[PDB]
Structures are given as structure tokens and as C-alpha cells.
Amino acid sequence: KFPRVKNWELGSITYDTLCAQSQQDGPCTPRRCLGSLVLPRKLPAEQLLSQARDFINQYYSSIKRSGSQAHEERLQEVEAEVASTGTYHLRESELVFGAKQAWRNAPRCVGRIQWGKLQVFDARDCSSAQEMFTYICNHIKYATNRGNLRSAITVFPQRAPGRGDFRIWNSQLVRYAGYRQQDGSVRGDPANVEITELCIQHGWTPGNGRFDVLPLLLQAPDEAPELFVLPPELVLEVPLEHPTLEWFAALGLRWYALPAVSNMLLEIGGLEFSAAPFSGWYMSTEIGTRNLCDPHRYNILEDVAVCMDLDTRTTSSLWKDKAAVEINLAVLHSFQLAKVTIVDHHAATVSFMKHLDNEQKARGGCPADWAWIVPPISGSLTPVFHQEMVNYILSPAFRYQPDPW
């Protein structure tokens, strides 16, 4: 009736009962599993009222004031506001609780042990792209904290029935340019070709390097996006070198300290926050393995292998595996040297097992997407490989949304 969940390394079993709290359908059916898909195909008063009620219930329960006078009266306010206006507004503490919960509920995040520690900036009094820019700079400054990174989210004004959304066009707050060449190849980050071209077209003067930090395209409702250059001093970067391989630094590779996602929608109690960028810190495999070694990213494996004089002629010398390990080591080494927060995939997955255990006792379950939780190198060397996981959508939630153009 409820899934039995087993860890195959330790032989232990739990039962997920939290999944019964889901009211939002994923992509799978009994005929076929679509759990490996990156995006869903997918991309009213009575229904808003019930999501609103359920969330306010979640909130008064968390502060143990469930059933109290304040609880009853808050349910009255939400109802009164919805019945008259078709929408409502959260109190700041509710917002803070909802933001933490959305992160707690995020199935693709291996960093959730940290979920209770989140600085929430209320930017709902934002009324212009210029104001968005100031809030975003304050966030970057707070979060970066000279390398001692602190989790944060900034929440811009919710979507409203009448008008366009507040949006940040960039997928992250820091992104390196990707310049398409005559010969179809890319200079810089192939993942950002399209945003790079949008920036240029809205007036940005492009450089010509592999690691040019992009400007931000910020959009206030029903207005053209505006371009804002991040002051170079706010964007902490880490030059990559290797503990033992001297030539590695001569690759001139680097990455930014702050992973801040800015294209996801935050849904809390039926309300939708179309711009609500959040940041934590990197797990090294995001940089070392994916951003640098994906064939459709910086694609440096071969280059590194040749520098290592590895036998490139044949897959069976495991040249790819050997080069990837060294690149992941260089990332860890460099971030440690620069005193910038980072976590390796072993430490991260161990803390996630602890999180799974915490959540079992607290909530009777934890929604997790095995394909995203298990790291991109050394999967079975981490405890999460051997752990069964149930994936489902709880609300508050972070969600994908269409690109504004």
C-alpha cells in the first residue's frame, strides 16, 4: 500500500508514508517509468483556497500552534482575501517557512541536510528591474561572504492575474558566455550560447574569452528586460590548479564560487514566485565532472589526458576515468586553497544518508530522485547508490517554468 524502501549495503528497510501527502502527479504510470526524464512533458478559487489552507495548516503545525486562535484567524484572513480578490499574500514568517520547506522537499538536491539554514530576503516590495538588480547584488554579497558561503534565497513579487511576471532571464546569477563561431564550434560555455546572444542583442558588448561573466537580464512586468553588469568584485572566482601536476594551472581553467539558480519558480500555498533565486555551495563533481568534462560543456577530458600523456587510443586504458579524477581533485584542491566552501561527493552523499534518516523520523519519508542524487563519477562508491528512493512532488516546491522569450 505504501512503498517498502531498502538499503542494499546495510540490509535495512523503511516504509515511505510521506508520499501519501502528494497531490501533484509525476510523469510515471504503471505501464511505463519516466523517472529518468529531465523535464515534464507539461511545459481557480476553490483550488487556490485548498492549497492555501493546507499550507497555513503546515505553518501553524511547524510552530506547534496548530488549532490555536491565531491559526483560526489566519485561515479567516486567507479566505476573506481570496473570496474578494481571487488571491492573497503571505506573512514574512510564512514565506520564510515556505522557502525552507520547498528546499526540504526538492527531490533532486543532495544538499538537503542544510535545509533548516537558509537566509530569506523578502524582495516583494520590488517594482523595477533596477530594484531587482540591487536586491540581487545584496544576495550575492551576503551569500558569498568572502568564500564562507551561506545559503540564501531572495523572493521577488509573486505572479498576479493581470500582468507579466518578474523574471530573471539568466538560468544562474553567474554564467560564462558561450560565443558561437563561424565554423559552428563554441568559445566558452556551450550551455549559455542562447543567453549570451540575448545579452548581445539587448546591447551588451561581448568579450572574446572562455570565461567572460555574463550580464544579467532582468525583467519587471510587461517591460523589456534590462541589462546589468555585475561588478567584477562581487563575483568570486577560483583559478584551478592541481596539487601535484604543475602544468594544470597552465590550462587557465577557473570556476565561480557561487551556484545561484535563478530560473525556477517557487510555489508556496498556491502562490507563485516566478523570480526567487537561491544559492548554496557547489559539490565538486558539478564543476569537476559535469561543467568541465561533459562533451557538450567545456569538454576538457582529452586535453587533460594528453597533458597527462595518457594512452588516448583505446577506451580500455581508462584514460577518461583517470583524467576526470584528476580534474575533480584539482577543483577540490583549488577551492580549499582559495578558502571557498565546497563539498566533495563522498562527504555530500554521507550527509544525505544522515538527512534520509532524519526525515524518516520527522516526516516518515523523503522524496528523492535517485538519478540526480547519485553523483556523476564513482556512483557505487557512494552510499546513496545502494539506497532505494521514492520520488514524488510535495508542496511547497521549486518548479521549472518556461523561458520568458
Ligand X SMILES: C[C@H](O)[C@H](O)[C@H]1CNc2nc(N)[nH]c(=O)c2N1
* Binding residue ranges for L-arginine: 172, 281-282, 286, 291
Instruction: Spot the catalytic one: 19, 94, 104, 109.
Output: 109
Cβ proximity to ligand X, 254 vs 386, nearer residue: 386
372 contact choice in its own copies, ligand HW9, ligand X, none (CB below 5 to 8 Å, kind-dependent) = ligand X
Between CA 284 and CA 339 the distance in angstroms is 14
Q: Which stretch binds ligand X (CB under 6 A): 128-136, 227-235, 334-342, 386-394?
A: 386-394
Cβ proximity to Zn ion, 259 vs 367, nearer residue: 367
Q: Within 336-395, which residues bind its own copies (CB under 8 A)?
A: 336, 344, 346-347, 350, 369-371, 374-381, 385-386, 388-392
Residue 397 has what DSSP assignment? E
Could you say whether residue 8 binds ligand X (CB under 6 A)?
yes
Other Cβ atoms closer than 10 A to 25: 11
Q: What is the CA radius of gyration of the chain?
A: 23
For ligand HW9, the binding residue among 126, 216, 264, 271 (CB under 6 A) is 264
Decide if 240 contacts 255 (C-beta within 8 A): yes
Element (H, E) at 98: helix 92-104
Query: CB of 86: closest distance to ligand X in angstroms?
Result: 37
228 contact choice in ligand HW9, Zn ion, ligand X, none (CB below 5 to 8 Å, kind-dependent) = none
Query: CB of 253: closest distance to Zn ion in angstroms?
Result: 37
Between CA 291 and CA 285 the distance in angstroms is 8
Between CA 216 and CA 154 the distance in angstroms is 15
Determine the size of the site formed for ligand HW9 (CB under 6 A): 11
Give me 199's grid cell. 545579452
Helix axes 92-104, 45-62, angle to 10 degrees: 90
Active-site annotation holds for 286? yes
Cβ proximity to its own copies, 3 vs 404, nearer residue: 3
Decide if 239 contacts 366 (C-beta within 8 A): no
In angstroms, what CA-CA distances link 69 with 52, 62, 303? 18, 15, 66
**Cβ within 8 Å of residue 381, ≥6 positions away:** 346
For Zn ion, the binding residue among 33, 37, 250, 362 (CB under 5 A) is 33
Instruction: Spot the catalytic one: 112, 159, 175, 399.
Output: 112
Query: CB of 36: closest distance to ligand X in angstroms?
Result: 4
Active-site annotation holds for 167? no
Instruction: Spot the catalytic one: 115, 169, 204, 281.
Output: 281
Q: Which stretch binds ligand HW9 (CB under 6 A): 136-144, 176-184, 255-263, 333-341?
A: 255-263
Could you say whether residue 297 binds ligand X (CB under 6 A)?
no
Phi/psi of residue 219, nearest 5 degrees: -125, 115
Between CA 187 and CA 206 the distance in angstroms is 12
Q: Within 10-69, which residues bind ligand HW9 (CB under 6 A)?
A: 38
Residues noted as catalytic: 109, 112, 281, 286
